[PDB]
């Protein structure tokens, strides 16, 4: 079709946006960020501007998502939300 | 103590207002900085009160420069004669 | 020193394939950039120097890339047949296969070709054998060959050097 | 409304929502990067003329038939603006766990 | 003449030549910064005496494409003055930071400083709204990297809230640019103001509100400020000057530029009636949060926000008798806040830290650097015949004809409060000492004092300098002589 | 030229089930990695749809930048 | 013997200083929702 | 539940405000008031038949300059935020050998192709930035599949500043006449110019500036991931 | 030509049955194997199909050249993706299905 795949891509970007912030696992949040860069690149290409599509491909796919998990390497991986005696204090 | 006397000759020889409040502020500062040598709590109380007086005068001159339009003190008595024949109980 | 122009030749022919309308008034620019990309890093393609220009060898590989692709299409249609609606359940495999290949790009090529056959996913190549995430286990737990799990790609990768 | 307008403003919406309510710091940076992504998506989706389309050919396609040559230059900087700002903020996200002991906004007390 | 286009290119080429000489040695790294900002004062003074020679600004073109299709650098009567004062302040910083910041890797600090100078001469020369955004993001990431450059936990977090707030504001600013372009289709402010009268009354409101919003976040008023009395408290001492002198003025000018570029549309009056209210809300909160303040660097950090809020008070009130006097505060408060963070910086580098307990006792112990803090703290309330007295009188008289007596009795209330936390500070450094340690510091005993004699000459002669801002108000007051001096 | 497009849209929202549900930490990763290749095969398909020779120039660039991402996501999991 | 103050303990009353007891309008409230978040008593609780 | 629901209310009124503010035009044609000049005068005024590479380096000529200023400032900012004089790898935890040899042979396959992107801003879309970012990707593949791979820093950021200087020296020797004036196709300064208008004799001035900016942004992100993969 | 119009149909039914095979798998490992199988050979089928779509149609032939470039590039890059996805998935727990034998990799870890 014409507009139906557009609605599919845009609702897929929204469901990968909402589920990019609902998770606690930060590696999963980098996964959601990479999928958002995916659907943004596809929407850039489908809106007929290939310059921004290939630039956002080379930036958001493995220089914004692969720099973020690159930062959670020597940091946390969970939310660490905690059972317990002296807890939630 | 000599800056204060030049404030004192300034307020008395003030026939405009932009020489008036300048000289008044210089006088307030010079008197404060004279009594700002010991017992700071006594000094700063005088400074806060007299700055509140100086700057409430700046508020009043802001209102009487707004409502009339002109700033000059000799002619501003003439236009008060002009409306001599609800915002002025604040002034 | 001859492997440098070997890397130049491979980068040049990839540049030739990448640009459909190759013009002689354009090709000097790609030849220049293939040259600077070669002299940047030509310490990478060291598969025993330049000596891969054998007319038997490249004809062997191009004659057996449809051999590869026929294995891929047949094995992938087989794993498409594996999706039966209540039935044909796949159990995993862990079964191993040993190699005798030097020229470590051959270990790459065996791992890639076995990853492109029915589901035989490589995991953790060591220096003696391979470890394969196989399909439904009926052949063997340890395999003393390769023809029971895969097709003999080991004989044609034996002559990649 | 068209899907591009709603989807670009909802990506900015979700990126804004991930700054207010979330508590882990790297989740806040995820919200910043998402919101910048939706911003440059809106920045492209302003000039689509619904029709004639070849921004870069000008050889096989006739001229005066390309789409929006102004925002494609506004977005070529404004994307890598986002990755440079994110690469800058990630260094602070590393230093805050190195010097302090945690990465939660209610526990970082100077 | 486009020969004076080196206000951006010369800091650029020198900031790209300083990582070229970072491996050639260690000696000529920090002395490479002083000679270039001296060359910056030279190329600024060229533009300064060429702008005030005639009545025409230099329309620095971006090539062989006349505006609006290209970028124009309208270096107006405003711009040459501010490029001059940022050149002389950065040259005062370069001869300061030579022996005051060597604790940390100054191997790469020089390019970060000079790129802030690039964002400086870019931000107060921009003509395109795109170039406005790009130079503001240069200054923003400069500040992200340079308020974090101490790596001490309390300074690491001091950047963090600013990087996430400047990220959200730049995001909103690009949305506002996309909406103003979405109605008009043009970008250059010359072709924008002649068009933005009948584009759409319901589209220009949200775009202008979000543009003023997203340009305000990198500056300070009420919500988006509290990173700034966290940035001055935790930064290298020379860049606390260059932030408190410069970066507040570029944001407040470019906000008050583009606000006076759309002065015909509906809903604009409510926008400036919000901007009045938020500026009054920031002269009270900032200059009253310094009252029970312990750290003396924070005690000046709160004071620098309260002085820029009253700049915002008269930069968006009317058209005249106070916009041309609002600039009279921006070129004046930069000098007196250069004096403040010099003295705090020299205390923090000589004695150690900025706590009052190690700030107490500087009458006999320290030389006339303490007199420089004295004559600086005198000039923020503006008591004697000084320059902030002249300027604050011009701003309070500016808030007469429109927005009166409530947006006066809060800014003028704060100077009563600011009268308190200075003479609780000058008293505990001159008349509480009990400690005669000579500790000679005669390397700034002349240079800060020739600066301290620069506020004593403008204090007695404002009319050789107040005639400048009459012809330098002509870049913000109107649109018609601005546009006709472009097209 | 037209029917394949709606089939690929059916394919990608049918792959959405693995990233929404799925209790493990890596089933989401196998969800995104397959989602890139089907959209690369989408991006080649639109070159037929808009008849443009330049629209393949983004497809191979996205065929790189999936692979770097999924190595980087699956390298901290091992080290 | 070792009397601590002379007037050091006695403090000054204050108008609007109780607003610093209003700080916990936004922190997490310290309670345990007993249906059903359990407590796990001590390893040697007397029972 | 108070904070999330109240944020959803305020963000719904924000989105409704923007959507009511998005009532300019339903994706119509009437947008270019100055934008038609960018399209109808791009084949003869610059030389690049590409639309976006002529508007952002020649027309909006001080905006890829602020862009490389932003990327260079990101490099020097991350390098100033992380500085310890030790700079060791993490534990390096090898893991696979079809990965190291996998990214070994694949490293010049991206090095050939990333250069192809930034040399071609004439008929191909893009510019210097996707090619430079995938050159950084190739650097990352060799950096995330080996046990050290420390490219020598003394001699690495020299060429980054040299490439930025190579941009600005085209502005400074461009100042031999006027503001920019391209120095390359309209006057026979060092070589010829304006041969035809295809992908032959490299159009006008736009390719060599993309080689230089692609070299700058190519060594940009590789340095960032380098000094961010360094422990004590 | 028309043979391309059937080959891309074969590749897109291969795509759809691939994606159906992703959700019709019990555990992680068979989910990973069948997804990296059937979504990367029908890929090359589609790409060479679009090339021979442009054999006589299209403009001349040059789409086939870029098609064979991206196909031959996509053919060798997804095996390394599947390996590095699988190999990291064995660490940090992540157990397998009820297989016949799984221990031969575990025992050759703990051989010491």
Author numbering:
A (entry chain d): 3 to 84, 88 to 94
B (entry chain x): 104 to 188, 201 to 206
C (entry chain a): 7 to 167
D (entry chain g): 2 to 111
E (entry chain h): 2 to 488
F (entry chain b): 4 to 82
G (entry chain N): 6 to 52
H (entry chain e): 4 to 235
Question: What text does the study give?
Answer:
Here we present the cryo-EM structure of an early ancestor in the evolution of complex I, the elemental sulfur (S0)-reducing reductase MBS. MBH and MBS are found in the anaerobic hyperthermophilic archaeon Pyrococcus furiosus, which oxidizes the redox protein ferredoxin, produces H2S or H2, and conserves energy by pumping Na+. 1) in the hydrothermal vent environments that P. furiosus inhabits, into two shorter polysulfides (Eq. 2). MBS contains two proton pumps compared to one in MBH and likely conserves twice the energy.
The atomic model contained 26 protein subunits and 116 transmembrane helices (TMHs). The MBS monomer consists of a peripheral cytoplasmic arm (MbsJ, K, L, and N), anchored to the membrane by MbsM, and coordinates three [4Fe-4S] clusters that transfer electrons from ferredoxin to the substrate polysulfide. The second contact involves the tryptophan-rich C-terminal extension (W90, W91, and W94) of MbsD of one MBS projecting into a largely hydrophobic cleft in the peripheral domain of the other. In MBS, a large hydrophobic chamber, similar in size to those in MBH and complex I, is formed by cytoplasmic MbsL, MbsJ, and their membrane anchor MbsM. In MBS, this structural motif is three residues shorter than it is in MBH, leaving one of the cysteines (MbsJ C25) no longer able to participate in cluster coordination. The unique Fe atom of its p-[4Fe-4S]2+ cluster binds polysulfide (Sn2−), accepts an electron from the medial (m-)[4Fe-4S]1+ cluster and catalyzes the two-electron reduction of an internal disulfide, generating two smaller polysulfides (Sn-x2- and Sx2-) and the superoxidized form of p-[4Fe-4S]3+.
